[PDB]
Design a protein around this ligand. Structure first.
Ligand SMILES: CCCCCCCCCCCCCCCCCC(=O)OC[C@H](COP(=O)([O-])OCC(O)COP(=O)([O-])OC[C@@H](COC(=O)CCCCCCCCCCCCCCCCC)OC(=O)CCCCCCCCCCCCCCCCC)OC(=O)CCCCCCCCCCCCCCCCC
Ligand SMILES: CCCCCCCCCCCCCCCCCC(=O)OC[C@H](COP(=O)([O-])OCC(O)COP(=O)([O-])OC[C@@H](COC(=O)CCCCCCCCCCCCCCCCC)OC(=O)CCCCCCCCCCCCCCCCC)OC(=O)CCCCCCCCCCCCCCCCC
Ligand SMILES: CCCCCCCCCCCCCCCCC[C@@H](O)O[C@H](CO[C@H](O)CCCCCCCCCCCCCCC)COP(=O)(O)OCC[N+](C)(C)C
Ligand SMILES: CCCCCCCCCCCCCCCCC[C@@H](O)O[C@H](CO[C@H](O)CCCCCCCCCCCCCCC)COP(=O)(O)OCC[N+](C)(C)C
Ligand SMILES: CCCCCCCCCCCCCCCCC[C@@H](O)O[C@H](CO[C@H](O)CCCCCCCCCCCCCCC)COP(=O)(O)OCC[N+](C)(C)C
Ligand SMILES: CCCCCCCC/C=C\CCCCCCCC(=O)OC[C@H](COP(=O)(O)OCCN)OC(=O)CCCCCCC/C=C\CCCCCCCC
Ligand SMILES: CCCCCCCC/C=C\CCCCCCCC(=O)O[C@H](COC(=O)CCCCCCC/C=C/CCCCCCCC)COP(=O)(O)OCCN
Lengths: 122, 171, 71, 83, 105, 347, 115, 175, 98
């Protein structure tokens, strides 16, 4: 079952609709971006170790490129993920607002009027 | 699902044009030049109504126009037309090409007697206009009322409340 | 002209079939005569089993394979 | 320009069939784009009336549509009789 | 899964051949052109789930045109009753159903 | 074989898959499958020997049968509704035949016999291609018709695939057959959640493809096709064996590794329906795959097996060819669990 | 109907000729007379043994080249379309592709028979 | 009920299919497939498809010639099997014939759902067209539309045929 | 459906069954594959002619083309197997197990 495959107004291969520009972009110090940079640094270290080079010192340009590439991809990945979650919430709220019969707000009862069974522990 | 309405057998009777295919082919060009208006009216009715039961009077008018045309041809150019359609009829493909003398004589006869000019090449295949008092049908397909669509997406996009909200994650 | 006479021929065959079926199918209890099989009320082209369904097999053979077998 | 001429002469001396085939294929490939009668063939194809021309309803605002086949309006096939 | 490259670029690689009501050469119509046209128009834009219920009538008519099951059922019922009537000798079929008609052009 | 011809054949395989993925007409999808198979057959025979010829013949027979059933299902669907568009598949018999044909193409149990045999009979590069790229087209078609799918048949085949993958993998000393049974079990996991959520199918497919690529590239790096030949790799390149051990742990599904994420999300999705018993059985069964991954880890990384004298000569030389994407594949196979909410971008 | 009658007539005439050939003359069959002919000496092996095909590769190419004939046969009708530029481009594309396949197999010694 | 020609042709089609599916020998199997191709050409001809029937007959004749050569080269033995030379082949052949006859009787005397749907018969004349128009063959126009509408189909088909030539050369290379 | 449709579908089922049960010769199974292709051609042609779908008249030609490609592929593989064993028996393809 595909929930969002055919939502009206969806452009086939866009990856970032113009509507997404109305959302605050992720901060450059976002911990998820830092974790992506950590992944890139780990990839650089593993690249050094597999090629039988000094793991920490062998190629600084290669390690920098690894970290930069992972951060660069992660930024747009996070933007798209946040856009999808915003879309989900927007649709949920619109549907609840347009179908009041299926989401009734029934009367609130205080705990002084609700009869709860007591189960002794003994 | 309802009964099908059909005309009575009496409503379907009409004076019949009972000439063979070769006679019709021999006279076709002048017939399309002379009886154009009722034929175009009938074809417009037929292609607009999409129902043969609604264009019966037009078919009768087509038959009457064809009968008048052939009565005139009989009254004025009997023998040349007979020679022409016999020539046309002998051919297995009913070819215009193999009988030009007979066609020329028939054309001269009709031009002098009735002032009939044979249509030029490319003229009978023209798309023409018909002026009719028949109202344009509004629902020729008998369509039902179309269902209404899902309303639309509306409003400004705000960030998801509390993030993804998937398990432990706060973002 | 061919279109007009084809329309008359099809309508005549349909009317003949309707009348003969009304004669035949009055014996059974719950058979609406001339009842359609489509929910829509617009004209539908006959299936040629509905025009030649009550006629002799020579007519059926000529109507079905007449053009294919003419060589 | 000098080695290819020798190649052409050698091919004509050893494989005339292939030389003729390639020349014919190249001519067939390139000539139709340089011919003025290609559009004439297209027009002849477009002028063949396979189906019936359904007439248009007169709304009183179509001067360009004839009211009769012999009227001066509409397309003409006079170019075809001179071909 | 499905990358709608055709929709994104507007190419029409194969959509021209998907349905019977789509621009045949020389304007030759399909046998069930009107039924498919009505079913498509009725179900357009409402989604697959809604369409399966709210366009059931048009789809049923289209399938009836396609396969013609109810038509042969009705014809065979009529012919069975006619044969039963003639076997007991109570029909006397008309002369125009036996080849002695008066044909019209 | 000429490198130009090899590149042309690879592009034809990928062109068939892309034609399957972008088409709207059933005929074009069938054509994509035919083109993919036609180009794939010679790639399996690139290194010519009787085993490769046998593998190619078995693959051709299985896939040709599957495509014949696919075309018949398409034609039946056309007969009962004059539609060529890939949609809800208006006929149930046609849908059943379509499901069986796609299952045959994927290698889902009961039709799973060909996969171990073809994988063992070809080279590691051909096995990489067969077990990674060749899953995309049938899975995409299954995703596009997921609504009309019958849950009882698909779930039966998925559970059978998980069971048979575990049981068959338990018995293998050849690495290619182990990979094939692992592939069968992962295909079962992929198809179990397909009627409920295709995003989970895509996520599981991507994670499995990453782990499989990492495993096959590690195996190509250390030229081992048997367990005993892999038991020598510690005395030549210990880092390779350590990375392979961690990747094997990830394949098993142990948290906090990335392998655990698809199983976790599929279990959650199935419990969002009622569906309680099936995920429990699926996890209990995946324990078998974990067992034989752990046995491989015991043999190659956690203990040291005896070596031979001639390994000393190998110590003096380096690996000439280098796989540029192997470090990224290993990192994505292992350390990706904290980025789980990013799966929202898949739908 | 007419073509079926023609087929029936021709097959019947051939069958009647065979029947007359086998029932009119005097038959004197004995084992030496009916033995296989190999120029007066008995054959060594069986004629049902495998017989090598030196042109096997050309035979497979005939299967593929035969299907392009089915693609080219509708060409007389395709010349009547309005968009003659698209049709002519596609007819030449198919024929160029067919000549390229012949050129490839020719240069790779695919037309030479096995020895 | 009109002369039962289409039903007889389809029955002979099924009989030839049973003939080659019992697998007596490749020489015999090719003969059965040739007979099936002929009757299928006839069946399609009786529906207006002259071009398609003739084309499929020609294609299968060429294919079976290649198959005959290949059978003589690679699929022979001292005593080739016929439908009565082996209990397995004869049993499969008789089982197929009896299954076909049972299905024919079952669907002809009753009106029952075999597997997919039901069928009463009446001959395939009933569902015909009674369409009256044209100076052209609709099938011919549809097939000729491959060069104006089917550009994508032409591209993929030509590419696949060229790739097939390359593929057979690669497969039979050996080494 | 009419009787002809059931007959063509029965022919397809028989050819599939024929392919599924192997005797000794590989070539027989290839013949069964071609038979399935022919049955599909006939069925699709009948359906397309009955519904007067003009643009669908060209699909069976494409089907025949890819059937020819499939048959060529199978024949090449048979050539290789026979060159390896001197026989096209499916019993010889047993080097790889499950
Ligand atoms: C959760 C919280 C966060 C945690 C994150 C996850 C864990 C950490 C990240 C993981 C990946 C990172 C490293 C990847 C490359 C490592 C590969 C490697 O071989 O390393 C050797 C390498 C030594 O090589 P060398 O120095 O060139 O010379 C010695 C020779 O090479 C001698 O080498 P040799 O090859 O000759 O020796 C042979 C040896 C070589 O074999 C190995 O070295 C094994 C390494 C495998 C890498 C791990 C696989 C991929 C990552 C998955 C981890 C999963 C974690 C989740 C939990 C599951 C546990 C597995 O093999 C064996 O002896 C067999 C022993 C069998 C034991 C099996 C266990 C192996 C798996 C254990 C993995 C545990 C995690 C990583 C451990 C640390 C590794 C360095 O180690 C290093 O020196 C690098 C490590 C330190 C780098 C980070 C330092 C950062 C800079 C300092 C400043 C910090 C900034 C702070 C900011 C604030 C300002 C002050
Ligand atoms: C250079 C360093 C730098 O510039 O950092 C600035 C950056 C500024 O961030 P902030 O908004 O000031 O910090 C907010 C608090 O950390 C408070 O953090 P938060 O509430 O914004 O947390 C963000 C959220 C999202 O964070 C993440 O998903 C990735 C965080 C790394 C996961 C830990 C495992 C790897 C170590 O964290 C979680 O949802 C927790 C779930 C993490 C577990 C994921 C599943 C695997 C479990 C372990 C296996 O702080 C850091 O990067 C701290 C180091 C991380
Ligand atoms: C094991 C780790 C998995 C990693 C997988 C590979 C990661 C690197 C690959 C880079 C992806 C490049 C693609 C983006 C370029 C533009 C293409 C874009 O237009 O594609 C869009 C699609 O976007 C892509 O799907 C997003 C790709 C991002 C995948 C990463 C998510 C992995 C899950 C969380 C694990 C953490 C990942 C960390 C990465 C380092 C089109 O949307 P749409 O045509 O309408 O969808 C078709 C499918 N439908 C309709 C059936 C739904
Ligand atoms: C060009 C194509 C069209 C031509 C049209 C004519 C076609 C003719 C039909 C084809 C057959 C021609 C052959 C003519 C020779 C006769 C062959 C046979 O029929 O005669 C004998 C048939 O007789 C049988 O042997 C037994 C005798 C009759 C069997 C009794 C069956 C019950 C019939 C009732 C008979 C009672 C009186 C009949 C009048 C009412 C067979 O004898 P046999 O030696 O082996 O064969 C070799 C013949 N020799 C001797 C000439 C060399
Ligand atoms: C982004 C990367 C690009 C390069 C990779 C391309 C990969 C695919 C290969 C070719 C691209 C396909 C695009 C062409 C699709 C064909 C349809 C489109 O082009 O329109 C046609 C235009 O046709 C043009 O001639 C363009 C086609 C020319 C093809 C040249 C050969 C290219 C193929 C080479 C690659 C294929 C494999 C290798 C074999 C050589 C029809 O136009 P028209 O007839 O007005 O309208 C039809 C509708 N009617 C019927 C109502 C009138
Ligand atoms: C394709 C174009 C040609 C078509 C063929 C038409 C040919 C018609 C010519 C008719 C010629 C007459 C046939 C004469 C030869 C018959 C066979 C023959 O000669 O055998 C001799 C044989 C020897 O018998 P015995 O002495 O008892 O035994 C000795 C052995 N121990 O004698 C006979 O059997 C004679 C029987 C007469 C045969 C019948 C001939 C009648 C004509 C039939 C023509 C068929 C046309 C239909
Ligand atoms: C530009 C449009 C192209 C399309 C039109 C062509 C249609 C189809 C024609 C091509 C069919 C396939 C081509 C076959 C290629 C043959 C390759 C080959 O191996 O050639 C040798 C022969 O060597 C050659 O290559 C012949 C010469 C080079 C090719 C022939 C000429 C190439 C083009 C020359 C003319 C170009 C255009 C003409 C301009 C005329 C100048 C005024 C064959 O001989 P063998 O069988 O090997 O002999 C073995 C026994 N000892």
């Amino acid at each position: 079952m595909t929930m969002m495959s055919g939502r009206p107004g969806r452009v086939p291969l866009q990856f970032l609709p113009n509507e997404a520009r109305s959302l605050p972009p992720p901060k450059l110090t976002d911990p998820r971006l830092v974790y992506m940079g950590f992944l890139g640094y780990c990839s650089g270290l593993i690249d050094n170790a597999i090629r039988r080079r000094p793991v920490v010192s062998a190629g600084l340009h290669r390690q920098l490129l690894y970290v930069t590439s992972f951060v660069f991809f992660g930024y747009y990945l996070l933007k798209r993920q946040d856009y999808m979650y915003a879309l989900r919430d927007h649709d949920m709220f619109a549907y609840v607002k347009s179908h009041p019969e299926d989401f009734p707000e029934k009367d609130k009862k205080t705990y002084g009027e609700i009869l709860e069974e007591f189960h002794p522990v003994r | 699902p309802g009964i099908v309405e059909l005309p009575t057998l009496e409503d379907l009777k009409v004076q019949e044009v009972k000439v063979s295919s070769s006679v019709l082919k021999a006279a076709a060009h002048h017939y399309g030049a002379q009886c154009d208006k009722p034929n175009k009216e009938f074809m417009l009715c037929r292609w607009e109504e999409k129902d043969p039961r609604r264009c019966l009077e037009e078919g009768k008018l087509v038959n009457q126009c064809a009968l008048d045309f052939f009565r005139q041809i009989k009254r004025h150019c009997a023998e040349p037309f007979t020679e022409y359609w016999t020539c046309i009829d002998y051919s297995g493909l009913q070819l215009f090409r193999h009988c030009r003398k007979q066609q020329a004589k028939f054309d001269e006869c009709v031009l002098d007697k009735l002032g009939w000019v044979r249509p030029d090449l490319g003229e009978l295949s023209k798309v023409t206009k018909v002026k009719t008092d028949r109202p344009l049908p509004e629902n020729p397909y008998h369509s039902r009322a179309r269902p209404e669509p899902n309303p639309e997406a509306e409003g400004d996009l705000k960030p998801a409340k509390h993030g993804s909200r998937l398990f432990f994650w706060t973002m | 002209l061919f279109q007009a006479e084809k329309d008359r021929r099809v309508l005549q065959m349909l009317r003949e079939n309707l009348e003969e079926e009304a004669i035949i199918m009055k014996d059974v209890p719950d058979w609406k005569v001339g009842e359609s099989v489509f929910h829509t009320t617009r004209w539908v082209t006959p299936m040629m089993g509905e025009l030649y369904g009550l006629r002799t097999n020579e007519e059926i053979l000529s109507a079905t394979y007449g053009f294919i077998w003419y060589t | 320009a000098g080695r290819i001429a020798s190649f052409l002469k050698n091919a004509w001396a050893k494989e005339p069939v292939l030389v003729a085939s390639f020349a014919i294929g190249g001519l067939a490939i390139i000539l139709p784009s340089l011919s003025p009668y290609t559009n004439y063939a297209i027009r002849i194809n477009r002028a063949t009336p396979y189906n019936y021309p359904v007439p248009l309803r007169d709304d009183g605002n179509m001067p360009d549509v004839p009211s009769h086949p012999q009227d001066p309006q509409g397309p003409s096939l006079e170019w075809l009789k001179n071909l | 899964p499905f990358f709608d490259v055709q929709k994104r670029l507007g190419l029409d690689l194969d959509r021209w051949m998907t349905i019977q009501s789509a621009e045949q050469p020389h304007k030759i119509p399909g046998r069930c052109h009107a039924f498919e046209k009505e079913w498509i128009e009725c179900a357009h834009g409402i989604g697959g789930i809604r369409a399966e219920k709210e366009c059931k009538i048009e789809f049923d008519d289209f399938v009836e045109c396609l396969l013609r099951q109810k038509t042969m059922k009705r014809l065979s019922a009529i012919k069975r009753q006619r044969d039963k009537l003639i076997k007991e000798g109570k029909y006397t079929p008309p002369p125009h159903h036996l080849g002695k008609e008066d044909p019209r052009p | 074989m000429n490198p130009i011809i090899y590149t042309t054949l690879i592009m034809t395989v990928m062109s068939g898959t892309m034609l399957v993925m972008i088409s709207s007409h059933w005929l074009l999808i069938w054509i994509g499958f035919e083109m993919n198979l036609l180009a794939m057959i010679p790639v399996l025979m690139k290194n010519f020997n009787p085993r490769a010829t046998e593998a190619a013949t078995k693959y051709f027979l299985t896939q040709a049968t599957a495509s014949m059933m696919l075309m018949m299902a398409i034609i039946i669907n056309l007969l009962y509704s004059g539609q060529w568009t890939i949609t809800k598949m208006f006929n149930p018999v046609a849908m059943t035949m379509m499901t069986m044909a796609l299952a045959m193409k994927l290698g889902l149990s009961p039709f799973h016999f060909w996969v171990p045999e073809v994988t063992q009979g070809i080279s590691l590069q051909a096995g990489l291609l067969l077990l990674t790229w060749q899953k995309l087209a049938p899975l995409s078609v299954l995703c596009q018709i997921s609504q009309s799918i019958n849950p009882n048949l698909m779930l039966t085949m998925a559970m059978l695939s998980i069971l048979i993958g575990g049981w068959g993998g338990l018995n293998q000393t050849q690495l290619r057959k182990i990979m094939a049974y692992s592939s069968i079990a992962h295909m079962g996991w992929m198809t179990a959640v397909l009627p409920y959520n295709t995003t989970m199918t895509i996520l599981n497919l991507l994670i499995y493809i990453t782990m499989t690529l990492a495993m096959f590239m590690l195996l190509i790096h250390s030229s081992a096709t048997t367990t005993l030949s892999l038991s020598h790799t510690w005395n030549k390149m210990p880092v390779i064996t350590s990375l392979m051990m961690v990747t094997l742990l990830s394949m098993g599904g142990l948290p906090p590794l990335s392998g655990f994420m698809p199983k976790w999300m599929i279990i959650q999705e199935m419990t969002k329906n009622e569906s309680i018993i099936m995920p429990t059985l699926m996890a209990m069964t995946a324990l078998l795959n974990l067992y034989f991954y752990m046995r491989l880890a015991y043999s190659s990384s956690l203990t040291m097996f005896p070596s031979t004298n001639n390994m000393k000569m190998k110590w003096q030389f380096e690996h000439t060819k280098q796989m540029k994407l192997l470090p990224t594949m290993i990192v994505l196979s292992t350390l990706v669990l904290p980025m789980t909410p990013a799966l929202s971008s898949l739908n | 109907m007419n073509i079926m009658l023609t087929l029936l007539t021709n097959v019947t005439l051939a069958s009647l000729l065979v029947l007359i050939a086998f029932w009119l003359p005097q038959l004197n069959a004995y084992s030496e007379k009916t033995s296989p002919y190999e120029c007066g000496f008995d054959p060594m092996g069986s004629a049902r043994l495998p017989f090598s095909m030196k042109f096997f590769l050309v035979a497979i190419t005939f299967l593929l080249f035969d299907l392009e004939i089915a693609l080219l046969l509708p060409l007389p009708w395709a010349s009547q379309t309005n968009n003659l530029k698209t049709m002519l481009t596609m007819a030449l594309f198919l024929l160029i592709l067919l000549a390229a396949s012949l050129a490839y197999e020719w240069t790779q010694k695919g037309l030479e028979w096995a020895e | 009920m009109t002369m039962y020609i289409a039903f007889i042709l389809s029955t002979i089609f099924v009989i030839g299919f049973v003939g080659f599916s019992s697998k007596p020998s490749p020489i015999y199997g090719g003969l059965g497939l040739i007979v099936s191709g002929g009757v299928g050409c006839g069946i399609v001809l009786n529906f207006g498809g002259s071009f398609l029937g003739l084309m499929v007959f020609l294609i299968y004749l060429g294919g079976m010639l290649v198959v005959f050569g290949y059978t003589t080269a690679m699929a022979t033995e001292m005593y080739p099997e016929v439908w009565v030379s082996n209990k397995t082949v004869f049993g499969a052949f008789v089982s197929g014939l009896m299954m076909e006859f049972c299905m024919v009787y079952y669907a002809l005397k009753e009106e029952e759902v075999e597997i997919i749907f039901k069928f009463n018969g009446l001959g395939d004349w009933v569902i015909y067209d009674t369409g009256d128009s044209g100076f052209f063959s609709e099938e011919a126009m549809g097939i000729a539309a491959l060069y104006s509408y089917g550009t994508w189909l032409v591209i993929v088909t030509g590419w696949s045929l060229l790739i097939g030539v390359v593929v057979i050369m690669e497969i039979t290379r050996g080494n | 459906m009419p009787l002809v449709y059931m007959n063509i579908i029965m022919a397809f089922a028989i050819a599939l069954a024929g392919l599924l049960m192997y005797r000794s010769h590989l070539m027989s199974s290839l013949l069964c594959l071609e038979g399935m292709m022919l049955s599909l051609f006939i069925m699709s042609t009948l359906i397309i002619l009955n519904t007067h779908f003009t643009l669908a008249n060209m699909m069976p030609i494409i089907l025949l083309v890819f059937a020819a490609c499939e048959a060529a592929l199978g024949l090449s593989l048979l050539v290789m197997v026979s060159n390896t064993y001197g026989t096209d028996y499916v019993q010889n393809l047993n080097l790889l197990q499950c």
